[PDB]
Amino acid sequence: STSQVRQNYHQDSEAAINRQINLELYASYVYLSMSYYFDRDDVALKNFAKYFLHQSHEEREHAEKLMKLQNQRGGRIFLQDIKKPDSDDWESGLNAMESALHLEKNVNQSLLELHKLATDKNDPHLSDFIETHYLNEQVKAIKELGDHVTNLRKMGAPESGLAEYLFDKHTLG
Amino acid sequence: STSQVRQNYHQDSEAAINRQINLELYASYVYLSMSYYFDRDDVALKNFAKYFLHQSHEEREHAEKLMKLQNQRGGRIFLQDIKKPDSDDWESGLNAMESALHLEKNVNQSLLELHKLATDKNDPHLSDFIETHYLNEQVKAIKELGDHVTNLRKMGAPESGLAEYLFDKHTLG
Amino acid sequence: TSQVRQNYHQDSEAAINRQINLELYASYVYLSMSYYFDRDDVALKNFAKYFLHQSHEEREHAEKLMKLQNQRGGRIFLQDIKKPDSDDWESGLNAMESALHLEKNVNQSLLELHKLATDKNDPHLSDFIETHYLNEQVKAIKELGDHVTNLRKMGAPESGLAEYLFDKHTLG
Amino acid sequence: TSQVRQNYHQDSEAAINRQINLELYASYVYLSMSYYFDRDDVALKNFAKYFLHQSHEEREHAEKLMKLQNQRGGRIFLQDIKKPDSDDWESGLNAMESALHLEKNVNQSLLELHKLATDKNDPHLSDFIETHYLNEQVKAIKELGDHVTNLRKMGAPESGLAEYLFDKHTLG
Amino acid sequence: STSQVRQNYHQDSEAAINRQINLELYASYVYLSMSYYFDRDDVALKNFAKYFLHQSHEEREHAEKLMKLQNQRGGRIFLQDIKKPDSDDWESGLNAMESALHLEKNVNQSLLELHKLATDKNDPHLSDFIETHYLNEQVKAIKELGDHVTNLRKMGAPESGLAEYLFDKHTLG
Amino acid sequence: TSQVRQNYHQDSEAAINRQINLELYASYVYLSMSYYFDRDDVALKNFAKYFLHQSHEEREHAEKLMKLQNQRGGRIFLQDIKKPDSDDWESGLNAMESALHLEKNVNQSLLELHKLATDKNDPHLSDFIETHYLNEQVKAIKELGDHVTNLRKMGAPESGLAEYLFDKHTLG
Ligand SMILES: [Cl-]
Ligand SMILES: [Cl-]
Ligand SMILES: [Cl-]
Ligand SMILES: [Cl-]
Ligand SMILES: [Cl-]
Ligand SMILES: [Cl-]
Ligand SMILES: [Cl-]
Ligand SMILES: [Cl-]
Ligand SMILES: [Cl-]
Ligand SMILES: [Cl-]
Ligand SMILES: [Cl-]
Ligand SMILES: [Cl-]
Ligand SMILES: [Cl-]
Ligand SMILES: [Cl-]
Ligand SMILES: [Cl-]
Ligand SMILES: [Cl-]
Ligand SMILES: [Cl-]
Ligand SMILES: [Cl-]
Ligand SMILES: [Cl-]
Ligand SMILES: [Cl-]
Ligand SMILES: [Cl-]
Ligand SMILES: [Cl-]
Ligand SMILES: [Mg+2]
Ligand SMILES: [Mg+2]
Ligand SMILES: [Mg+2]
Ligand SMILES: [Mg+2]
Ligand SMILES: [Mg+2]
Ligand SMILES: [Mg+2]
Ligand SMILES: [Mg+2]
Ligand SMILES: [Mg+2]
Ligand SMILES: [Mg+2]
Ligand SMILES: [Mg+2]
Ligand SMILES: [Mg+2]
Ligand SMILES: [Mg+2]
Ligand SMILES: [Mg+2]
Ligand SMILES: [Mg+2]
Ligand SMILES: [Mg+2]
């Protein structure tokens, strides 16, 4: 039966918010995996590790804010398994940055589909919520990752171990 | 290809540490679920929600320290899916505390088996690591949860919603 | 069974109750020694201060074991605290020698407790003993040995000047 | 005879040794009560704090009498500290009632000691008891009576809510 | 005649502690040698020199703490000659780092054998002492040297004098 | 040839390597002396502190000579550091006398090194030795002589009181 607070909140939107919660936790897990890959003694790029650990905690905050939104609107949180990332070995600083760029575009596409649904269901509170707290965050994150990929490629990564070392010091440090 | 840092680190220990990483992340997920259950408008116990959120972040720190240990010893992190918690609806403040008690004793049993393995493989760095950073933390967490369950029961929970309200204010507040 | 109890053998629980009693007994011995040096015919105030501090430390040792018993779900059963074996501690040197003997006795009990914890595969308890008790005992025994050595080298107990000057310069 | 002893009857000296033992016994009762409320199946942390503080106070009462014994030239003879009469204090209310009974017993002992000091014309000792012990006992008994009254009015011991809220609001 | 403080301290443990004192002093001497090699005018890597001098002083602290332990337990210190290091010319920053890694694993192996002995003689004060003050310090030192070796190799050392110069500035500086 | 080397004889370079070893040996002697006074059957903490400070000073002496070797373009060749000639230093007085003998031996080696620098017309090296080593040795020898004198006048080594009081008042 209906939550006493629920108003103008479609059940499709409620379901889509539960899917987005899972996706944000999955992104947190990907970045956690990347972080400790750069902590391996045979990789040993500590500012890559720090950068991705920070990204990982950001994604957990993204998930928690969606959980708060679900309850604010009177929907009900249903959590699902968080799938392990698709790689165990992220190969290089460049490959991890390219993988993170791909991940952030995938998350952005999911947020755009969620906004389209909120628009279709005439839910301006939800569409404003997505715009305010997620859409520009995604644009900034994608732009930053693109910048990082560009610099690593221009410096000669991944073949140049010196390039990744110096990028670790000067851009992520 | 052995890690250049690896010394006196059995492959069974390495595997057991990967299992413990997953279990700590699972415990983080359980407490996250419990937290936002108390944030529901039809539950609305904000200090229960705060308490379990703090516990959830603690478990993530537990997991990250084990990931650090794996790399310190030259083992290799292999992550697995984080299973969703066994309940979506935690029923009451008392039931969530009893469920957390059961979870912490299960994690403690896993840590004790890990310590037995480290002892069997004559790995005093690993057994010291478990003792120092995990075993007394578990004893303290179990004792605190037991205290909380006792007080909730004595106050009349879960039937008395007044009892859970006052416990939220006076013990968790 | 206590809802918190896990991997805690009943023999360990009993041994912890015995150790609580022994720590309280050590607190009582040091209290007795303290006020012996407060007698007008002994009158070594820094010996008195030193043993009173030791007495309060032992009470802290006991209270931490009582906390541990409840942390693990065991149940505290207290027993009489026996009076110390002397009323008159004779001299500064004899009190220090007696305290050395006491601390080695307590250390032996802690080592037996650690052996029990190891035998029962209780690493939380063995870590607790190592962390909070074993090096504290080694430091206490080393300090008392040092004190006994200095008092003997200075000419105690026969030299009342030796005990006076040790009271001022080492315990002061 | 002690070079400081003056107007100090042998009966007073003995009575002071008995009172030292009783104050240590009261410290032990309150220590036992404190850790009872620290059990995971009792779990009233401000009851535990309150009785631990009371326990340390009683140890101070004992030490002050030991100092008095030496001040007057008497000689301290310690005896076993008996264990408390209960292991399980049942409830916050029952512990408070037990502490009230204990404090009135200690007060009766101090009144008998004052009567002895009066009978032996020892005004230093009677003033010592009046100054440092008698009003302390009256205040402690009054406070415990207040606590017992509130717990009973609130519905203890049957109401676990009553003991929980008293732990927070009065002892907290 | 027995020391008045001696209790539960086997003569084999006492001897093993004297051997470990010598090994810690030997490690201090190796790092001292390495330090001033990088101070040569034809090597001239001042932060390599600083790093190894700091390591050298740490090892002297390790030795002094074991001397204190020997007296704490009532054993008797017997010092032996401190052997000169196995090289006079440490060749390169990378070779010094690889040599320090080998040294620290050797010292770790000695400490693990010492812990085994303490365990065999049921000396939990000594096993706790080793675990507390030595074993994790060795794991951290080995992990750090492994990280350093990895970066130097990735950067192109020892052939690249630029690699060692930039590592001196950015990692050790 | 080193690009920095100028007016630096190979005999001087070798003599500097010998002096590095001797300073490290002096550091080892004082380290041994330090922990001798840390034994529970010796137990003179300020003797232990004093010799540990001296030990660290000698390590600084050695490191400054290693820096000098590189400054002048010579090459450091290290040798084994021989263990000290005693394991048991017997007493505070004997340790002080042994340290006096050591410092005069080190001074003689420095004077021979200065003579070599003078013979090879190396004023940078002779100024280095004068500036950083020769007056340091004169001060160290004077201080050790003073200490030996006081210990002897006080009655050491036979008076354990003498060494105890010197530990407190001069080294404390
Ligand atoms: Cl709706
Ligand atoms: Cl709908
Ligand atoms: Cl992979
Ligand atoms: Cl650069
Ligand atoms: Cl190995
Ligand atoms: Cl291995
Ligand atoms: Cl459910
Ligand atoms: Cl059990
Ligand atoms: Cl059992
Ligand atoms: Cl007696
Ligand atoms: Cl006497
Ligand atoms: Cl002697
Ligand atoms: Cl009289
Ligand atoms: Cl009972
Ligand atoms: Cl209230
Ligand atoms: Cl032994
Ligand atoms: Cl032996
Ligand atoms: Cl060589
Ligand atoms: Cl040699
Ligand atoms: Cl010798
Ligand atoms: Cl010897
Ligand atoms: Cl004096
Ligand atoms: Mg981000
Ligand atoms: Mg996100
Ligand atoms: Mg926790
Ligand atoms: Mg955990
Ligand atoms: Mg073993
Ligand atoms: Mg003590
Ligand atoms: Mg104790
Ligand atoms: Mg430990
Ligand atoms: Mg009171
Ligand atoms: Mg009293
Ligand atoms: Mg008056
Ligand atoms: Mg180091
Ligand atoms: Mg070392
Ligand atoms: Mg000097
Ligand atoms: Mg010198």
Curated annotation (Swiss-Prot), chains C, D, F:
Which EC number applies? 1.16.3.1
GO CC annotation? autolysosome; autophagosome; cytoplasm; cytosol; extracellular exosome; extracellular region; ferritin complex; ficolin-1-rich granule lumen
Do the record's keywords include Acetylation?
yes
Looking at its record, which EC class is this enzyme? oxidoreductase
Q: What is the effect of changing residue 82 to Q?
A: Reduces iron binding and oxidation rate. No effect on iron binding but the oxidation rate is severely reduced
Protein keywords:
Acetylation, Cytoplasm, Cytoplasmic vesicle, Iron, Iron storage, Lysosome, Metal-binding, Neurodegeneration, Oxidoreductase, Phosphoprotein
CDD domains, alphabetically?
Euk_Ferritin
Q: In which tissues is it expressed?
A: Expressed in the liver.
What does the record say mutating residue 18 to A does?
Answer: Abrogates interaction with NCOA4. Fails to localize to punctate lysosomal structures
Positions annotated to bind Fe cation 2: 58, 103, 137
- The reply to whether Transferase figures as a keyword in the UniProt entry is no
Q: One matching Pfam family, short form?
A: Ferritin
| MF annotations from Gene Ontology | ferric iron binding; ferrous iron binding; ferroxidase activity; identical protein binding; iron ion binding; iron ion sequestering activity
In its UniProt record, what illness is this protein linked to? Hemochromatosis 5: A disorder of iron metabolism characterized by iron overload. Excess iron is deposited in a variety of organs leading to their failure, and resulting in serious illnesses including cirrhosis, hepatomas, diabetes, cardiomyopathy, arthritis, and hypogonadotropic hypogonadism. Severe effects of the disease usually do not appear until after decades of progressive iron loading. Neurodegeneration with brain iron accumulation 9: An autosomal dominant neurodegenerative disorder associated with iron accumulation, primarily in the basal ganglia. It is characterized by global developmental delay apparent from infancy, and progressive decline of motor and cognitive skills. Clinical features include delayed walking or inability to walk, spasticity with hyperreflexia, ataxia, dystonia, and poor or absent language.
Query: Quaternary structure per UniProt?
Result: Oligomer of 24 subunits. There are two types of subunits: L (light) chain and H (heavy) chain. The major chain can be light or heavy, depending on the species and tissue type. In the human liver, the heavy chain is predominant. The functional molecule forms a roughly spherical shell with a diameter of 12 nm and contains a central cavity into which the insoluble mineral iron core is deposited. Interacts with NCOA4; NCOA4 promotes targeting of the iron-binding ferritin complex to autolysosomes following starvation or iron depletion.
Similarity comment text for this entry: Belongs to the ferritin family.
State its role. Stores iron in a soluble, non-toxic, readily available form. Important for iron homeostasis. Has ferroxidase activity. Iron is taken up in the ferrous form and deposited as ferric hydroxides after oxidation. Also plays a role in delivery of iron to cells. Mediates iron uptake in capsule cells of the developing kidney. Delivery to lysosomes is mediated by the cargo receptor NCOA4 for autophagic degradation and release of iron.
Q: What's the name of the protein? A: Ferritin heavy chain
What organism is recorded for this protein?
A: Homo sapiens (Human)
Its taxonomic placement starts with: Eukaryota, Metazoa, Chordata, Craniata, Vertebrata
